[PDB]
Scaffold this active site. Structure first.
Site, mmCIF file in Angstrom:
data_model
loop_
_atom_site.group_PDB
_atom_site.id
_atom_site.type_symbol
_atom_site.label_atom_id
_atom_site.label_comp_id
_atom_site.label_asym_id
_atom_site.label_seq_id
_atom_site.Cartn_x
_atom_site.Cartn_y
_atom_site.Cartn_z
ATOM 1 N N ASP A 35 0.849 -1.190 0.000
ATOM 2 C CA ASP A 35 0.000 0.000 0.000
ATOM 3 C C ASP A 35 0.882 1.237 0.000
ATOM 4 O O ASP A 35 1.482 1.567 0.997
ATOM 5 C CB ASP A 35 -0.921 -0.054 1.232
ATOM 6 C CG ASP A 35 -1.799 1.190 1.381
ATOM 7 O OD1 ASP A 35 -1.982 1.899 0.396
ATOM 8 O OD2 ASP A 35 -2.378 1.523 2.463
ATOM 9 N N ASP A 219 -2.302 5.396 -4.764
ATOM 10 C CA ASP A 219 -2.580 4.599 -3.582
ATOM 11 C C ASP A 219 -2.877 3.168 -3.965
ATOM 12 O O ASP A 219 -4.006 2.819 -4.303
ATOM 13 C CB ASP A 219 -3.769 5.248 -2.875
ATOM 14 C CG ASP A 219 -4.092 4.623 -1.526
ATOM 15 O OD1 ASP A 219 -3.501 3.584 -1.105
ATOM 16 O OD2 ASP A 219 -4.948 5.162 -0.788
HETATM 17 O O1 LIG Z 1 -8.606 0.724 3.520
HETATM 18 C C1 LIG Z 1 -7.405 0.441 3.440
HETATM 19 C C2 LIG Z 1 -6.533 1.602 3.331
HETATM 20 C C3 LIG Z 1 -5.603 1.836 4.279
HETATM 21 C C4 LIG Z 1 -5.309 0.964 5.463
HETATM 22 C C5 LIG Z 1 -3.983 0.599 5.789
HETATM 23 C C6 LIG Z 1 -3.743 -0.159 6.942
HETATM 24 C C7 LIG Z 1 -4.818 -0.512 7.787
HETATM 25 C C8 LIG Z 1 -4.605 -1.303 9.027
HETATM 26 C C9 LIG Z 1 -4.133 -2.541 8.923
HETATM 27 C C10 LIG Z 1 -5.157 -3.540 8.479
HETATM 28 O O2 LIG Z 1 -4.520 -4.801 8.321
HETATM 29 C C11 LIG Z 1 -5.448 -5.732 7.913
HETATM 30 C C12 LIG Z 1 -6.162 -5.613 6.725
HETATM 31 F F1 LIG Z 1 -5.993 -4.545 5.928
HETATM 32 C C13 LIG Z 1 -7.072 -6.587 6.349
HETATM 33 C C14 LIG Z 1 -7.284 -7.681 7.155
HETATM 34 C C15 LIG Z 1 -6.564 -7.794 8.329
HETATM 35 F F2 LIG Z 1 -6.774 -8.881 9.075
HETATM 36 C C16 LIG Z 1 -5.634 -6.834 8.709
HETATM 37 CL CL1 LIG Z 1 -4.631 -6.926 10.206
HETATM 38 C C17 LIG Z 1 -6.127 -0.147 7.452
HETATM 39 C C18 LIG Z 1 -6.356 0.604 6.310
HETATM 40 C C19 LIG Z 1 -4.723 3.090 4.262
HETATM 41 C C20 LIG Z 1 -5.231 4.157 3.290
HETATM 42 C C21 LIG Z 1 -4.365 4.133 2.040
HETATM 43 N N1 LIG Z 1 -4.521 2.935 1.239
HETATM 44 C C22 LIG Z 1 -5.901 2.476 0.995
HETATM 45 C C23 LIG Z 1 -6.792 2.608 2.239
HETATM 46 N N2 LIG Z 1 -6.618 3.917 2.884
HETATM 47 N N3 LIG Z 1 -6.991 -0.846 3.479
HETATM 48 C C24 LIG Z 1 -8.002 -1.878 3.705
HETATM 49 C C25 LIG Z 1 -8.804 -2.429 2.533
HETATM 50 C C26 LIG Z 1 -8.742 -1.935 1.244
HETATM 51 C C27 LIG Z 1 -9.519 -2.492 0.229
HETATM 52 C C28 LIG Z 1 -10.342 -3.565 0.505
HETATM 53 C C29 LIG Z 1 -10.385 -4.045 1.807
HETATM 54 CL CL2 LIG Z 1 -11.421 -5.422 2.226
HETATM 55 C C30 LIG Z 1 -9.617 -3.505 2.792
HETATM 56 CL CL3 LIG Z 1 -9.706 -4.132 4.463
HETATM 57 C C31 LIG Z 1 -5.571 -1.342 3.470
HETATM 58 C C32 LIG Z 1 -5.381 -2.419 2.408
HETATM 59 C C33 LIG Z 1 -4.765 -1.064 2.173
#
Ligand SMILES: O=C(C1=C(c2ccc(CCCOc3c(F)ccc(F)c3Cl)cc2)C[C@H]2CNC[C@@H]1N2)N(Cc1cccc(Cl)c1Cl)C1CC1
Ligand SMILES: *[C@@H]1O[C@H](CO)[C@@H](O)[C@H](O)[C@H]1NC(C)=O
Length: 333
Positions: A35, A219
């Site tokens: 990411d 992103d």
């Molecule tokens: O929503 C985000 C984003 C971000 C994000 C980054 C880290 C986190 C925390 C860690 C989450 O770790 C996860 C996970 F992402 C999914 C499942 C898990 F079990 C864990 Cl521990 C949360 C959101 C950061 C920010 C810039 N990039 C994008 C977006 N906004 N994310 C979650 C996401 C994106 C798309 C679909 C899904 Cl289902 C998810 Cl959970 C992170 C994958 C990139």
């Protein structure tokens, strides 16, 4: 140095692109999104309650199983849209493709069920800068750069359409087999965030939006192209789309007739046709087709900003260049 390391990505439904890493000794493997919109490594902790749906359905890192772990315990928190993601800092050896790095990462002990229980991946490897790291934890790509192994201090993304190789990240360079022509580059507005200037967003060959300039976060962790609620309102009006609670939609039959949307970045219009941004799950006039463009109000200091996610990256193979603080786009194959 002399290395480039690639990691194969699986494409889940054109919204989640993840690949494996290994943490610990012996390696505990995790599917992770790489990411550029974030700066920390996070995996779920074995300390995460099994009353978290997001934890039950995911692999959990267990420090008690790794001989190379070094305790830290510093609490870290991400205030996510649907609730807090939090856990604690730990250090272990992380392997990404052929690269091995000693890395501090967050072990998640609580997070919302939504959207995390819907993630086909376990975690997220933040590819952004230390400037945006929670706890100012040194990011992984910084640690990799410090090792002096890379051919070039860049990494690249290829995201395929669905669906066959789902995608590929390359550490240390790009992969010519997945783009055509040459890159065109755009300087970062500032070091610390993979964010560039955008001069305009056009529907058809007319410039409906961002006419006086705006920001574009590139992103890789975002599924969609996003704009502020107000920008997207206007884009979707220009397109004839209807607002649902969580997305925008058009009648499936008018999908293929939707205009080209163009993003003006550096010296180029990057053009998505309807085939690039409509989820064309039918051609029926009786059904609604979702658009791979959503509203998102990204708060300061990053936002307000557009975000160019997988929708944009599927079309344009993307190189993130740390050496030169620039992003390069080439037409994806
Ligand atoms: O929503 C985000 C984003 C971000 C994000 C980054 C880290 C986190 C925390 C860690 C989450 O770790 C996860 C996970 F992402 C999914 C499942 C898990 F079990 C864990 Cl521990 C949360 C959101 C950061 C920010 C810039 N990039 C994008 C977006 N906004 N994310 C979650 C996401 C994106 C798309 C679909 C899904 Cl289902 C998810 Cl959970 C992170 C994958 C990139
Ligand atoms: C954990 O590592 C960080 C460096 O980012 C440091 O600030 C902190 O003191 C360490 N925590 C403990 C309690 O060992």
């Amino acid at each position: 140095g002399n290395t480039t390391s690639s990691v194969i990505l699986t494409n889940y439904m054109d919204t989640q692109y993840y690949g494996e890493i290994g943490i610990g000794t012996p390696p505990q493997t995790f599917k992770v999104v790489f990411d550029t919109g974030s700066s920390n490594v996070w995996v779920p902790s074995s300390k995460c309650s099994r009353l978290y749906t997001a934890c039950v359905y995911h692999k959990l890192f267990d420090a008690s199983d790794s001989s190379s772990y070094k305790h830290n315990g510093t609490e870290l928190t991400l205030r996510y849209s649907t609730g807090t993601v939090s856990g604690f800092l730990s250090q272990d050896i992380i392997t990404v493709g052929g690269i091995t790095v000693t890395q501090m990462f967050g072990e998640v002990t609580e997070m919302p069920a939504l959207p995390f229980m819907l993630a086909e991946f376990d975690g997220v490897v933040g590819m952004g800068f230390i400037e945006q790291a929670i706890g100012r934890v040194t990011p992984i790509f910084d640690n990799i750069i410090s090792q002096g192994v890379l051919k070039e201090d860049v990494f690249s993304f290829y995201y395929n359409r669905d669906s066959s190789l789902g995608g590929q990240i390359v550490l240390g360079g790009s992969d010519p087999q997945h783009y055509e022509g040459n890159f065109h580059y755009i300087n970062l507005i500032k070091t610390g965030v993979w964010q560039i200037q955008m001069k305009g967003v056009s529907v058809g060959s007319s410039t409906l939006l961002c006419e006086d300039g705006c920001l574009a976060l590139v992103d890789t962790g975002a599924s969609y192209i996003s704009g502020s609620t107000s920008s997207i309102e206007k884009l979707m009006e220009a397109l004839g789309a209807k607002k649902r609670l969580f997305d925008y939609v058009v009648k499936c039959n008018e999908g293929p007739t939707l205009p080209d949307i163009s993003f003006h970045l550096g010296g180029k219009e990057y053009t998505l046709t309807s085939a690039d941004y409509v989820f064309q799950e039918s051609y029926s006039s009786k059904k609604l087709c979702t658009l791979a463009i959503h509203a998102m109000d990204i708060p300061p200091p990053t936002g307000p900003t557009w975000a160019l996610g997988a929708t944009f990256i599927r079309k344009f193979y993307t190189e993130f260049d740390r050496r030169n603080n620039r992003i390069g786009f080439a037409l994806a194959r």
